[PDB]
Design a protein around this ligand. Sequence first.
Ligand SMILES: CO[C@H]1O[C@H](COS(=O)(=O)O)[C@@H](O[C@@H]2O[C@@H](C(=O)O)[C@@H](O[C@H]3O[C@H](COS(=O)(=O)O)[C@@H](O[C@@H]4O[C@H](C(=O)O)[C@@H](O[C@H]5O[C@H](COS(=O)(=O)O)[C@@H](O)[C@H](O)[C@H]5NS(=O)(=O)O)[C@H](O)[C@H]4O)[C@H](OS(=O)(=O)O)[C@H]3NS(=O)(=O)O)[C@H](O)[C@H]2OS(=O)(=O)O)[C@H](O)[C@H]1NS(=O)(=O)O
Ligand SMILES: CO[C@H]1O[C@H](COS(=O)(=O)O)[C@@H](O[C@@H]2O[C@@H](C(=O)O)[C@@H](O[C@H]3O[C@H](COS(=O)(=O)O)[C@@H](O[C@@H]4O[C@H](C(=O)O)[C@@H](O[C@H]5O[C@H](COS(=O)(=O)O)[C@@H](O)[C@H](O)[C@H]5NS(=O)(=O)O)[C@H](O)[C@H]4O)[C@H](OS(=O)(=O)O)[C@H]3NS(=O)(=O)O)[C@H](O)[C@H]2OS(=O)(=O)O)[C@H](O)[C@H]1NS(=O)(=O)O
Lengths: 64, 64, 62, 62
Amino acid sequence: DLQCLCVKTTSQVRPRHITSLEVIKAGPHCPTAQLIATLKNGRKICLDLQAPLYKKIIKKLLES
Amino acid sequence: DLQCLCVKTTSQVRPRHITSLEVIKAGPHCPTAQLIATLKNGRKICLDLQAPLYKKIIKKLLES
Amino acid sequence: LQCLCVKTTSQVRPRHITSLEVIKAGPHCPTAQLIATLKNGRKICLDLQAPLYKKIIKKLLE
Amino acid sequence: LQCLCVKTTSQVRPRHITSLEVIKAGPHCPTAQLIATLKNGRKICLDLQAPLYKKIIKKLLE
Ligand SMILES: CO[C@H]1O[C@H](COS(=O)(=O)O)[C@@H](O[C@@H]2O[C@@H](C(=O)O)[C@@H](O[C@H]3O[C@H](COS(=O)(=O)O)[C@@H](O[C@@H]4O[C@H](C(=O)O)[C@@H](O[C@H]5O[C@H](COS(=O)(=O)O)[C@@H](O)[C@H](O)[C@H]5NS(=O)(=O)O)[C@H](O)[C@H]4O)[C@H](OS(=O)(=O)O)[C@H]3NS(=O)(=O)O)[C@H](O)[C@H]2OS(=O)(=O)O)[C@H](O)[C@H]1NS(=O)(=O)O
Ligand SMILES: CO[C@H]1O[C@H](COS(=O)(=O)O)[C@@H](O[C@@H]2O[C@@H](C(=O)O)[C@@H](O[C@H]3O[C@H](COS(=O)(=O)O)[C@@H](O[C@@H]4O[C@H](C(=O)O)[C@@H](O[C@H]5O[C@H](COS(=O)(=O)O)[C@@H](O)[C@H](O)[C@H]5NS(=O)(=O)O)[C@H](O)[C@H]4O)[C@H](OS(=O)(=O)O)[C@H]3NS(=O)(=O)O)[C@H](O)[C@H]2OS(=O)(=O)O)[C@H](O)[C@H]1NS(=O)(=O)O
């Protein structure tokens, strides 16, 4: 009934452009964790789990 | 980067078992609208768009 | 009263809404909650009043 | 002050959390928002305090 939201991660986007980050735990409908980021223009993208980039994105959004 | 969350709809579930319903507009990452329902036990399922069932689920959750 | 929607809002541009989640009342929230997510990822609590969320759900279903 | 997280909470079972969304501050919300979604679909606003959301994000990443 449900699959993963993200097909492939991305590496390049400006942390300034990010308004929202959702962290989704692995579940019955997706074997891997997911990192969905929403941008000012409505564009949604996926981040890499094995990178410190998500750590940078998160640390910024909270600092705002 | 993103696909649809729901693969196939469902027809049978008890409206009593439903705690949350999310209505997702069609977008660049999914050609069709989506109706995701969350249940007390954590189970998530998709509803049918061409049915009055979603109308029943929604009308109940608000009445609660 | 430990709800997501303490104060609630009536003014929003329906075209800016990408999703609407209806969360049911419970021991922790006296009322149902209408959470709308906008294009920019932000969220706001919709007034449970009638014609507001009526038109929205249909515009999400087009 | 028309935020999702007016009042905020500190007591939640991390195993009950299925997702955590960080919404950034803006002209409409003075602070960033930590919205946690539980197994039963409900949502609660997490305290922006340190060790609460630190352990959670990692438990979501296992
Ligand atoms: C191209 O060069 C540019 O370089 C950088 C990068 O640009 S980027 O950010 O676009 O990538 C620019 O730096 C940014 O400059 C500002 C900007 O983004 O415009 C500024 O952003 C902050 O302030 C924005 C202006 O808002 S306002 O307060 O001055 O009015 C704000 O964007 C506005 O958000 C409001 C809002 O959310 O309330 C919007 O208001 C409108 O919608 C509201 C909500 O609608 S709803 O549907 O019901 O929900 C309505 O209630 C309201 O009536 C309505 N107002 S109206 O005017 O339409 O009538 C409005 O449309 C938006 O423009 C930013 O909000 S945010 O959501 O994007 O975060 C806000 N960001 S903040 O800094 O975090 O507070 C910053 O200086 C900077 O943005 S950034 O976030 O730091 O990246 C640079 O300005 C620009 N150079 S330029 O070429 O000279 O322009
Ligand atoms: C098998 O036969 C059954 O038939 C029907 C159908 O069952 S079904 O609903 O499971 O499908 C049963 O009818 C239901 O009966 C009640 C029930 O579901 O148990 C009742 O539901 C309402 O009340 C529940 C009991 O709560 S309590 O207030 O009395 O304490 C409630 O479930 C509890 O929710 C709380 C909660 O959300 O706060 C939970 O508390 C615990 O977690 C909290 C939050 O954690 S968090 O992670 O931090 O977020 C903690 O804060 C708290 O400390 C902790 N308490 S503790 O006990 O663990 O220490 C608790 O775990 C839950 O059990 C229902 O909440 S809900 O979220 O499911 O909606 C609530 N539903 S409500 O009616 O909408 O308010 C109803 O009568 C009915 O449920 S229903 O929603 O109408 O469908 C029937 O009882 C049963 N017959 S039986 O065989 O005899 O049992």
